[PDB]
């Protein structure tokens, strides 16, 4: 089947699936297509919020079904980068984000070009190829920017 997914402000994308699929698989399929983290997504059918555990069958959702999508104001995990002045900015993340993505996010809010960022998390200079989870970075962790 091919269900529909749209937001309260335009953008109806389309998504090839099969009914045995869980909601978590759907939320992930939206991440690949839309670049939106799963835990930031909240999905709606028939007026109800669908849960990761239950499948598409369980929710009686068939082809051309339109799924309503509201974005959260936050995902689950966030960290802080202490800027050279001490100004601490807050960031939204997953334990899967590569340090490059983290810089990109800092470039977005701060305007510091990534080639000019250096990130330390309680000693240990962090590199573009690794993930926050590689460095065992938790929610509420604070990084320092040089």
């Amino acid at each position: 089947m091919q269900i529909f997914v749209k937001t309260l402000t335009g953008k109806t994308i389309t998504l090839e699936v099969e009914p045995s699929d869980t909601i978590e698989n759907v939320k992930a399929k939206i991440q690949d297509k839309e670049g939106i983290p799963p835990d930031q997504q909240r999905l709606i059918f028939a007026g109800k919020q669908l849960e990761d555990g239950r499948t598409l069958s369980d929710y009686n959702i068939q082809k051309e079904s339109t799924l309503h999508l509201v974005l959260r104001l936050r995902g689950g995990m966030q960290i802080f980068v202490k800027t050279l002045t001490g100004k601490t900015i807050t960031l939204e993340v997953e334990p899967s984000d590569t340090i490059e993505n983290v810089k990109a996010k800092i470039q977005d809010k701060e305007g510091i070009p990534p080639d000019q960022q250096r990130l330390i998390f309680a000693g240990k200079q962090l590199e573009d190829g690794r993930t926050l989870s590689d460095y065992n970075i938790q929610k509420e962790s604070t990084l320092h920017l040089v």
């Binding site: 309260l8 909240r42 309503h68 509201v70 959260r72 936050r74």
Partner: protein, 88 residues
């Protein structure tokens, strides 16, 4: 002789009246169906108040969690001092 004409002027008037009545019916239907589309979106808006509110509460308790730590260290930083200001 005026009995003929008072019927077909009364018939023609009523068939004309059927036309306007229908127009007003069709318009009032397409309007109810448009309005219907908008009404299909309020269950989502409602859910969104819930999502937002929950997201706000997460910020609140996180806020509290840090207020809590802050109150602890500043309580201990007056414990570290007391002996620092006597051994010197």
């Amino acid at each position: 002789g005026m009995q003929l004409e008072d019927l077909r002027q009364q018939l023609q008037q009523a068939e004309e009246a059927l036309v306007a009545k229908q127009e007003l019916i069709d318009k009032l239907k397409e309007e109810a169906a448009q309005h219907a589309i908008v009404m299909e979106t309020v269950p989502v808006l409602k859910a969104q108040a819930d999502i937002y509110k929950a997201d706000f509460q997460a910020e609140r308790h996180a806020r509290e969690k840090l207020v809590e730590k802050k109150e602890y260290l500043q309580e201990q930083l007056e414990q570290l001092q007391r002996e620092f200001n006597k051994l010197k």
